[PDB]
Amino acid sequence: SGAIYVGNYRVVNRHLATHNDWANLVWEDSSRDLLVSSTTAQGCDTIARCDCQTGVYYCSSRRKHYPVSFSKPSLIFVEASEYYPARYQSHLMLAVGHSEPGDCGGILRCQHGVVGIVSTGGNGLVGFADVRDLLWLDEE
Ligand SMILES: COc1ncccc1NC(=O)N1CC[C@H](C(N)=O)C1
Ligand SMILES: [Zn+2]
C-alpha cells in the first residue's frame, strides 16, 4: 500500500483505490495502473521533473529504502495477478530489487522529488509506474 500526496491530490495504484478515491476521482488510467483522487488537506510530496535513471524506493516487505537503477518508462508485459489479466502496462520502469504484491504504492524518488510508485515485480525485479510526465499534478 502507499500513496503520493502532492498539492490537493492523492496518487495511488488504480488496483488499490478505495471507494472514497472513486467518489472523489480526478483521473484514472488502467493501462498505467494509476488513479488520482482529490484531498481536503494539502500534501508535502513534490514531483520530480527530470531524467534521472537512479533513485531510491521504499520496500514495505523489508521496512527498508533501497537504491536502484531503473529503465526509462516503457510498454512492458506484466504477468496476470488477482487485479489484472496478463497484459502490457505503459509508462513502467523496471529495476532489480525485492518486491512482493503488497509492496505496491511504495515511493521511488530521486534528488528532484517523487518519480513514481511501486506497481509490479517478482523474482528479484521491481517495476514502478512513472508520474513525471503528469505535469498537471503541480497545479490547481
Ligand atoms: C509488486 O508486485 C508484485 N510483486 C511480486 C509478485 C507479483 C507482483 N505483482 C502484483 O501483485 N501485481 C498486482 C497488480 C500489479 C499491476 N498489474 O500493475 C501487479
Ligand atoms: Zn531526478
UniProtKB/Swiss-Prot annotation:
Active site residues according to the UniProt entry: 15, 33, 104
Reactions mediated catalytically: Selective cleavage of Tyr-|-Gly bond in the picornavirus polyprotein
Name this polypeptide is given: Protease 2A
Function description: Cysteine protease that cleaves viral polyprotein and specific host proteins. It is responsible for the autocatalytic cleavage between the P1 and P2 regions, which is the first cleavage occurring in the polyprotein. Also cleaves the host translation initiation factor EIF4G1, in order to shut down the capped cellular mRNA translation. Inhibits the host nucleus-cytoplasm protein and RNA trafficking by cleaving host members of the nuclear pores. Counteracts stress granule formation probably by antagonizing its assembly or promoting its dissassembly.
Complex and partners: Homodimer.
Binding residues annotated for Zn(2+) 1, in chain numbering: 50, 52, 110, 112
Species for this entry: Coxsackievirus A16 (strain G-10)
Domain of life: Viruses
